[PDB]
């Protein structure tokens, strides 16, 4: 086994890991691919998402050529710290983890020609600026940008290993998404100009579509049932002032409870979302059903109900039994067609 | 190989414990910041989180090299072998340098000896916010940059590029705040251990009112309006007018309770508190108005309709007048 020990000692003899390969001679070309083991949950409140990847980088270092019984050295990852590696970082990363349980989750393989393969297991939290105007029927393109921290494009360039569409692969059953659907991803590469120079940036946009099922169950269905309940009052006799006032005030309190609690998981945006409009309109219908009874009660003459002369069924009530359900159905037709 | 020999000679005999010009004039350090994002502006924790690219420039003559017309961008581990300023943030609470895939740090040398040293830092800096006009308040959050152990006789800070030393503020988009301006201040701070150079980066934040209109102001306005409906109901409908009056009082409590749970326990009255108290008084007085009407007819009868007709004007007029004084004072 001392043959392979002597090969490693020769490689590291007089080797400077402070210098990128080809420094002052050529541009270091780094080929990258990403295997997404899990696309983690998306946090709307923080406008961030989590992704777990195998981040693979490959480049050629002529100082690491060797001859031996094997053509590839599948080495302990501690060998990585003794050689030069790319200083890749994620531009939109917030707080990432390079896993090291039970050992640093890194592999290093050296081919005899001097090509290096260097992969690591990462958990990246990345910024995804969301536009929530169409929430909860919104779609987002969450980016994942990475590149060199220190080396400009005249020094280090990044490329995708295979075709860009094939250089980012997501595992078949690795979705940790709860309320989003990963429709697909687009792979690109660009250039960023900063105060320190011009840098290659490799981008991947993950296209996410929110699932509406949770908000139908917990927001849209309760709102609709509160509107339907508020219109049950129209079918009670006008001499039921306490009963029809309870209908009006409880549904208004219910809509207020729904309204202030529907944005609890969202960032406090200044603009109004699609769900805000639906709740505001449902509030108007519920508010108008209590104003309607006030008008009916104002034209009630006698304080006794039908068992002398008796009150008549209100014309306002007769038309409200039709107009209110009809206009709420029309709103739902326009609302859902506008956003779906 | 020439570069490798050059770097070894630079680091051979180099003393990291000594600053450049250790026994001479102070080393001038130029700083610029590229702000990547501001987030988590919290009134509960009284702090904001800032991600930035923190660049420091200084000339260390021990690192001057000749023969190479290149700027030597070295591996970031060489920073541990060089002298770097002991710069720190005074109001920083929790701060880390990003370390994926490697430590987000850069060292770039120049032939004359100039060192460019960059770090990607996320820091949570304390920002004590005065919330007396909340949610119509303007906050001023600062970042205080200081040398820890070197006084003004050993080190000097300046903003490299003047007023253009900080970039990226125009690209920041806060969901709840708008940045009005940012300033760069250079000054000295004296402690018991000496005078120290300080650089200040302050932002002025204006809170967006749109969220609070839908969340607290509009439900309070509509509930206050709804309590006037009792003025149009007959005096003898005690069950209906008490149910309406008490429900509007209960509704105002729910609005305040939800708002209270999202805020730090501050000892003074905020602007939004003043509005909910105003709306509560109007809702409370409408309920007390019926009790006055009920007492006059039943406890004193042995004009009832005048009081209700009078209230149909005064309550809408006084509440609109209250909104006039409130919004003129705070907007």
């Amino acid at each position: 086994t001392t043959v392979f020990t002597r090969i490693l000692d020769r490689l590291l003899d007089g080797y400077d890991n402070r210098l990128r390969p080809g420094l002052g001679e050529r541009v270091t070309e780094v080929k990258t691919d990403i295997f997404v083991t899990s696309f983690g949950p998306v946090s709307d409140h923080d406008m961030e998402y989590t992704i777990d990847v195998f981040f693979r980088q490959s480049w050629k270092d002529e100082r690491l050529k060797f001859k031996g019984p094997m053509t590839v050295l599948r080495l302990n990852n501690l060998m990585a710290s003794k050689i030069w590696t790319p200083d890749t970082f994620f531009h939109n990363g917030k707080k990432s983890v390079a896993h090291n349980m039970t050992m640093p989750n890194k592999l290093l393989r050296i081919t005899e020609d001097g090509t290096l393969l260097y992969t690591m297991r990462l958990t990246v939290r990345a910024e995804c600026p969301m536009h929530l105007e169409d929430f909860p029927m919104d779609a987002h393109a969450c980016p994942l940008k990475f590149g060199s921290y220190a080396y400009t494009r005249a020094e280090v360039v990044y490329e995708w290993t295979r075709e860009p569409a094939r250089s980012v692969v997501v595992a078949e059953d690795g979705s940790r998404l709860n309320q989003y659907d990963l429709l697909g991803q687009t792979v690109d590469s660009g250039i960023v100009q900063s105060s320190t120079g011009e840098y290659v940036v490799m981008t991947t946009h993950f296209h996410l579509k929110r699932k509406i099922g949770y908000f139908v169950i917990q927001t849209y269905l309760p709102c609709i049932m509160t509107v339907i309940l508020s219109q049950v009052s129209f079918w009670l006799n006008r001499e039921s002032v306490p009963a029809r006032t309870v209908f009006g005030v409880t549904t208004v309190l219910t809509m207020t409870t729904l309204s202030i609690s529907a944005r609890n998981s969202l960032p406090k945006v200044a603009y109004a979302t699609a769900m805000d409009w639906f709740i505001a309109v449902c509030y108007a219908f519920v508010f108008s059903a209590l104003i309607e009874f006030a008008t009916v009660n104002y034209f009630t003459k006698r304080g006794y109900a039908w068992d002398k002369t008796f009150n008549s069924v209100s014309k306002i009530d007769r038309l409200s039994r039709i107009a209110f359900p009809l206009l709420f159905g029309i709103f739902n037709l326009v609302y859902w067609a506008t956003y779906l | 190989s020439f570069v490798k020999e050059t770097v070894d000679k630079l680091l051979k005999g180099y003393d990291i414990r000594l600053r450049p010009d250790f026994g001479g004039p102070p080393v001038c350090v130029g700083m610029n910041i590229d702000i990547a994002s501001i987030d988590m502006v919290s009134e509960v924790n009284m702090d904001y989180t800032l991600t930035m690219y923190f660049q420091q420039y200084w000339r260390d003559k021990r690192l001057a090299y000749s023969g190479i017309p290149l700027n030597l961008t070295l591996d970031n581990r060489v920073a541990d072998q060089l002298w770097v300023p002991d710069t720190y943030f005074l109001n920083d609470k929790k701060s880390f340098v990003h370390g994926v895939t490697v430590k987000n740090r850069m060292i770039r040398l120049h032939p004359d000896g100039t060192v460019l040293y960059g770090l990607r830092i996320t820091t949570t800096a304390a920002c004590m916010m005065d919330l007396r006009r909340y949610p119509l308040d303007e906050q001023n959050c600062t970042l205080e940059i200081e040398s820890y152990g070197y006084t003004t006789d050993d080190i000097e800070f300046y903003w490299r590029g003047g007023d253009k030393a900080v970039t990226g503020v125009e690209r920041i988009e806060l969901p709840q705040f708008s940045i009005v301006e940012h300033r760069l201040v250079s000054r000295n701070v004296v402690f018991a251990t000496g005078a120290y150079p300080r650089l200040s980066l302050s932002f002025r934040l204006k809170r967006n009112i749109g969220y609070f209109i839908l969340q607290t102001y509009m439900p309070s306005i509509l509930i206050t309006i709804l309590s006037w409906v009792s003025f149009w109901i007959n005096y003898d409908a005690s069950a209906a007018r008490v149910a309406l009056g008490i429900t509007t009082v209960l509704t105002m409590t729910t609005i305040n309770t939800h708002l209270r749970e999202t805020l730090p326990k501050i000892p003074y009255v905020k602007a939004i508190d003043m509005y909910l108290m105003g709306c509560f008084v109007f809702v409370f007085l409408a309920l007390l108005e019926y009790a006055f009407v009920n007492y006059i007819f039943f406890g004193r009868g042995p004009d009832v309709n005048a009081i209700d007709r009078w209230s149909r004007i005064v309550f809408p007029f006084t509440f609109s007048l209250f909104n006039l004084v409130y919004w003129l004072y705070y907007v």
Epitope: H91, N92, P129, H131, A139, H140, A141, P143, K145, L183, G184, T186, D188, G190, I191, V192, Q193, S194, V201, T203, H205, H207 | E170, R171, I172, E173
Partner: nanobody, 123 residues
């Protein structure tokens, strides 16, 4: 209402330098991707350049290294510098802004479009 107004253009001599600027109003596009497209006569819209909130520049292959895209986030504007102009570059240049859903190079991802500036190169 949201409006995007291109400026510059007209006629330019071969090899001339032209700067095309776009002014946006009615909505702040700080978090959006502001792009440039061109449409040769009898041809589909061709992606030229884009620049997102992080100042990352994307380019089409035919214009990479020739055209430069910059943004004035304070002025809510995007500019496209045209250099090495050739008669093949004569088209209608469009300013666009969008969230880049299903790709920032596809024209269907941009919701806001300018009217269009005619750029012509005479040889």
């Amino acid at each position: 209402q949201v409006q995007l107004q291109e400026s510059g253009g007209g006629l330019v001599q071969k090899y001339g330098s032209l700067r095309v600027s776009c002014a946006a109003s009615g909505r702040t596009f700080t978090t959006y991707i502001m792009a440039w497209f061109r449409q040769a006569p009898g041809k589909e819209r061709e992606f030229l350049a884009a620049m997102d909130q992080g100042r990352i520049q994307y380019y089409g292959d035919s214009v990479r290294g020739r055209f430069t895209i910059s943004r004035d986030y304070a002025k809510n504007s995007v500019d496209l510098q045209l250099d090495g102009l050739r008669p093949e570059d004569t088209a209608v240049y469009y300013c666009a802004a969008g969230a880049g859903f299903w790709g920032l190079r596809t024209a269907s991802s941009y919701h806001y479009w300018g009217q269009g500036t005619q750029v012509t190169v005479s040889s």
